[PDB]
From Swiss-Prot:
Function: Component of the spliceosomal U1 snRNP, which is essential for recognition of the pre-mRNA 5' splice-site and the subsequent assembly of the spliceosome. U1 snRNP is the first snRNP to interact with pre-mRNA. This interaction is required for the subsequent binding of U2 snRNP and the U4/U6/U5 tri-snRNP. SNRPA binds stem loop II of U1 snRNA. In a snRNP-free form (SF-A) may be involved in coupled pre-mRNA splicing and polyadenylation process. May bind preferentially to the 5'-UGCAC-3' motif on RNAs.
Name of the featured protein: U1 small nuclear ribonucleoprotein A
Gene this protein is translated from: SNRPA
Naturally occurring in which organism (per UniProt): Homo sapiens (Human)
Range within the parent protein: 3 to 91 of 282
Disulfide bonds: none
Family, similarity comment: Belongs to the RRM U1 A/B'' family.
Subcellular location: Nucleus
Residue stretches making up the RRM domain: 8-87
In-chain residues carrying the UniProt-annotated modification N6-acetyllysine: K58
Assembly behavior: U1 snRNP is composed of the 7 core Sm proteins SNRPB, SNRPD1, SNRPD2, SNRPD3, SNRPE, SNRPF and SNRPG that assemble in a heptameric protein ring on the Sm site of the small nuclear RNA to form the core snRNP, and at least three U1 snRNP-specific proteins SNRNP70/U1-70K, SNRPA/U1-A and SNRPC/U1-C. Interacts with SFPQ; component of a snRNP-free complex with SFPQ. Interacts with IVNS1ABP (via BACK domain); the interaction is indirect.
Consequence of substituting R50Q: Abolishes RNA binding
Length: 89
């Protein structure tokens, strides 16, 4: 059940786990900067957050535009799964 409450942060799933944090960040920034100001991009070197990223936009509308635009966009040969970050509560 996807998160549907619009949020300035997008949760991205199903990313290619063979890519170095530093390359993935640079490549996410390249495809997401179009939608507006990115505050940060969180990827981890964990087993908890491996095929997973947070793109934190300044504006919710940036996030909504990035979500619709890039839903299923093939990135390192895998369609990205994008939802809104979980709500404040």
């Amino acid at each position: 059940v996807p998160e549907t409450r619009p949020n300035h942060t997008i949760y991205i799933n199903n990313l290619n786990e063979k890519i170095k944090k530093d390359e993935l960040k640079k490549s996410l920034h390249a495809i997401f900067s179009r939608f507006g100001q990115i505050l940060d991009i969180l990827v981890s070197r964990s087993l908890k957050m491996r095929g997973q990223a947070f793109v934190i936009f300044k504006e919710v509308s940036s996030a909504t535009n990035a979500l619709w635009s890039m839903q299923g966009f093939p990135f390192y040969d895998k369609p990205m799964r994008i939802q809104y970050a979980k709500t404040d509560s």
